[PDB]
Amino acid sequence: TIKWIDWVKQIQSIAQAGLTYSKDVYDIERFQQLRDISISMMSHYTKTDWEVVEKLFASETGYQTPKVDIRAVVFQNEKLLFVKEKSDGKWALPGGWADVGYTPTEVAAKEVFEETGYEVDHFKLLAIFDKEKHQPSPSATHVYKIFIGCEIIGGEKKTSIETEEVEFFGENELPNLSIARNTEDQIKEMFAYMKDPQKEKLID
Amino acid sequence: TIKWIDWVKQIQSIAQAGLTYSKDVYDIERFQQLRDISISMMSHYTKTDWEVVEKLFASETGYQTPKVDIRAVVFQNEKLLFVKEKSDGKWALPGGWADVGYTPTEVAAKEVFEETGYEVDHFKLLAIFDKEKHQPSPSATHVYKIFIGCEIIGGEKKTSIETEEVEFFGENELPNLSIARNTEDQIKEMFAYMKDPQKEKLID
Ligand SMILES: [Gd+3]
Ligand SMILES: [Gd+3]
Ligand SMILES: [Gd+3]
């Protein structure tokens, strides 16, 4: 069983919350002890160095919420824009982690420019999917995925020698998907939005 | 040797002291959470250890994104559901930070219930606002604010311990708004979603 992952995540989150909001020196202290126990459990049951765990799992200030992933949904002539990335050799919509300081649409703009060379605007909110519901894997965190539609208003598509790396793909010729970044049904949903742009915008 | 046993004992031992001693309702709610979980972990078989999940942190870098706030938009008879927390005697839609382990709609449901006693369903994605763009509050915290409409289907009007008053207000009679949790303009746009259910979703 790996139910423990969720329990430990909950414990740390509540300890993190306590440390942010408690104003009582003795309870703040209790929360801190509680945070350290959670690091120790995590460190032991993943076989990961304590300080590494503290960094990656318990170094955040303020209340703990899921993290934000942005995916940009760009159509040219009925085909959807994908990028293949280093690790997988598998294809994903342009996007990534949402940066502090940047609005959801700004992250979408930056990631499209960076990953594809295209310049985008006229943004549409299309869906928010829960990562843990749609592409589950044992994970220390929890991820919300915002899909934002964009129109190409400029720039130009990246070029790549000997490797295909940025293409548009049609509904019946989808490439090998990076499931962690987008599931098949998530992609399908964007085509359903394509064929009927006024439909229910999905939220998990 | 099975190390999870004594870690869970400490968690309960500490959370037990926490809820015996603390006179802060928020801290109390946190320690009761921690007591529940430890109990839920205790009830498992005490001779079995947890599956080790190595490389749980192999993929992750500790990357930080903006936090997530969820606001529920609930209309009864053309009036919008507001909640008054004590601190400042000010009014906000049911909502709050999203928690690890919950989908966005699960958050909205959970906070409506806790704060008001109502059961909601029939979720509809309305808007994602960037917090820094609408209600700059001197803290450093970057927050994405998801507005999710939904409908009462059951429950009971129940005033909790964190909440002084639960009331619905029409567009021309808005209470003194907690600007931090919701601006007057965001409230206005929510009313425009009611008038026109095909209004374009706002996204910063
Ligand atoms: Gd990327
Ligand atoms: Gd509460
Ligand atoms: Gd609240």
Structure tokens at A131: 């990562």
* B interface test, pick of A9, A13, A14 with most B CB neighbours within 10 Å: A14
Beta-strand ranges (E) seen in A110-185 are: 118-130, 143-155, 166-169
Structure tokens at A114: 């960076």
Q: A48 and B26 in contact by Cβ < 8 A? A: no
Closest CA to B80 of B202, B185, B174, B177: B174
Greatest distance between any 2 Cα atoms in chain A: 63
Measured over the CA atoms of residue A133, residue A136, residue A139 and residue A141, the dihedral's sign is negative
Secondary structure (3-state) at A2: coil
Please tell me which residue of chain B has the smallest CA distance to A69. B65
Q: What's the distance, Cα to Cα, between the start and end of chain A in Å?
A: 26
Count of other CB atoms within 10 angstroms of residue B38: 21
Quote the CA–CA distance of B22 and B28 in Å, as a whole number: 6
Phi-psi region of A3 (alpha: psi -120 to 50; beta: other; left: phi over 0): alpha
Give the A:B interface size as CB pairs under 8 Å. 191
Nearest to A53 among B54, B57, B101 (CB): B57
* A interface test, pick of B10, B26, B28, B53 with most A CB neighbours within 10 Å: B53
Domains of chain B (ranges plus CATH)?
Answer: 1-39 (6.10.250.1120), 64-204 (3.90.79.10)
Quote the CA–CA distance of A163 and A158 in Å, as a whole number: 12
* B interface test, pick of A2, A7, A36 with most B CB neighbours within 10 Å: A7
Nearest to B11 among A1, A6, A37 (CB): A37
* Partner B contacted by A148 (CB < 8 A): yes
Residue B178 C-alpha to ligand 2 middle, in angstroms? 17
Task: Identify how the structure was determined.
Answer: X-ray
Count of other CB atoms within 10 angstroms of residue B72: 28
Q: B148 and A59 in contact by Cβ < 8 A? A: no
Nearest to A128 among B40, B61, B104 (CB): B104
Residue type, A173: E
Residues paired with B75 in a beta bridge: B80
Q: A144 and B104 in contact by Cβ < 8 A? A: yes
Count of other CB atoms within 10 angstroms of residue A39: 23
* Partner B contacted by A199 (CB < 8 A): no
Kindly state the helix (H) or strand (E) to which residue A173 belongs, with its residue range.
none
* ∠ CA A12-B18-B83, rounded to 5°: 75
* Nominal resolution (angstroms): 2.5
Structure tokens at B126: 């309305």
Beta-strand ranges (E) seen in B33-172 are: 67-76, 79-85, 91-92, 95-97, 118-130, 143-155, 163-169
Q: Strands A118-130, A202-203: parallel, antiparallel or unpaired by DSSP?
A: parallel
